[PDB]
Design a protein around this ligand. Sequence first.
Ligand SMILES: *[C@@H]1O[C@H](CO)[C@@H](O[C@@H]2O[C@H](CO)[C@@H](O)[C@H](O)[C@H]2NC(C)=O)[C@H](O)[C@H]1NC(C)=O
Ligand SMILES: *[C@@H]1O[C@H](CO)[C@@H](O[C@@H]2O[C@H](CO)[C@@H](O)[C@H](O)[C@H]2NC(C)=O)[C@H](O)[C@H]1NC(C)=O
Ligand SMILES: *[C@@H]1O[C@H](CO)[C@@H](O[C@@H]2O[C@H](CO)[C@@H](O)[C@H](O)[C@H]2NC(C)=O)[C@H](O)[C@H]1NC(C)=O
Ligand SMILES: *[C@@H]1O[C@H](CO)[C@@H](O[C@@H]2O[C@H](CO)[C@@H](O)[C@H](O)[C@H]2NC(C)=O)[C@H](O)[C@H]1NC(C)=O
Ligand SMILES: *[C@@H]1O[C@H](CO)[C@@H](O)[C@H](O)[C@H]1NC(C)=O
Lengths: 109, 49
Amino acid sequence: KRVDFCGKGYHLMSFPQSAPHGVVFLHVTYVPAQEKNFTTAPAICHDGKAHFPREGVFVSNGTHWFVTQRNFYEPQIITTDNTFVSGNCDVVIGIVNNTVYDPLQPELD
Amino acid sequence: AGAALQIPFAMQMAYRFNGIGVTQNVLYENQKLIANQFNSAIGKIQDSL
Ligand SMILES: *[C@@H]1O[C@H](CO)[C@@H](O[C@@H]2O[C@H](CO)[C@@H](O)[C@H](O)[C@H]2NC(C)=O)[C@H](O)[C@H]1NC(C)=O
Ligand SMILES: *[C@@H]1O[C@H](CO)[C@@H](O[C@@H]2O[C@H](CO)[C@@H](O)[C@H](O)[C@H]2NC(C)=O)[C@H](O)[C@H]1NC(C)=O
Ligand SMILES: *[C@@H]1O[C@H](CO)[C@@H](O[C@@H]2O[C@H](CO)[C@@H](O)[C@H](O)[C@H]2NC(C)=O)[C@H](O)[C@H]1NC(C)=O
Ligand SMILES: *[C@@H]1O[C@H](CO)[C@@H](O[C@@H]2O[C@H](CO)[C@@H](O)[C@H](O)[C@H]2NC(C)=O)[C@H](O)[C@H]1NC(C)=O
Ligand SMILES: *[C@@H]1O[C@H](CO)[C@@H](O)[C@H](O)[C@H]1NC(C)=O
């Protein structure tokens, strides 16, 4: 996890080869590509409660809000298993209104 | 690690709080105090210099 100790990018793995009086390291790394821009927010307010992502960031495609993982764009809908709650929505700078979906009660019809 | 991708600075500070074991609500609920403390700490360096 040391930055730039094993090449440029996120180190995946490395292979050694012998040279005359030396060694050659072939570093395999992961390099992110083809980014898009989005709107973002730190928390989400629902029922007077602030919701934070468990892992990921809240992003908006223009009209809807999703959670994604931070390094590869893979959007999902914001549920109570995606997030955790802390406090009320009066203290966070930049909080946004949206609905956080519960699975249990629409299972219970 | 590649191309520069923008992110707002308080959200970068929250990632970094996660990286030491503190949840990020602890940053967002203290943002103003944390920024005051950083500013006083930076203002103390030029005084010693
Ligand atoms: C943002 O993504 C959503 C996808 O959830 C698009 O909204 C539509 O949402 C309904 C119900 O959620 C789906 O049945 C549709 O298939 C979605 N797409 C369309 C084209 O109707 C929404 O269009 C996206 N917004 C932008 C600006 O890209
Ligand atoms: C990001 O910065 C913009 C300014 O560029 C902020 O927008 C202003 O919001 C205030 C309310 O606090 C309004 O009174 C101003 O009229 C807005 N200005 C513009 C140019 O839109 C925005 O609130 C900031 N975002 C956050 C999360 O603080
Ligand atoms: C997000 O939703 C909340 C919930 O209603 C909004 O809070 C209201 O804000 C208006 C204007 O600031 C007040 O007149 C109401 O009294 C508030 N309602 C409650 C129940 O407190 C909040 O304004 C919404 N945020 C945005 C940006 O529209
Ligand atoms: C955590 O520590 C900080 C000290 O940096 C406290 O904030 C200070 O509180 C004193 C009260 O004695 C104020 O006079 C200062 O102005 C505060 N500093 C800043 C930068 O706001 C804070 O109260 C402490 N929190 C708790 C829960 O004890
Ligand atoms: C994102 O938008 C900015 C302008 O706000 C633009 O300069 C940048 O090239 C865009 N990047 C992508 C991936 O769309």
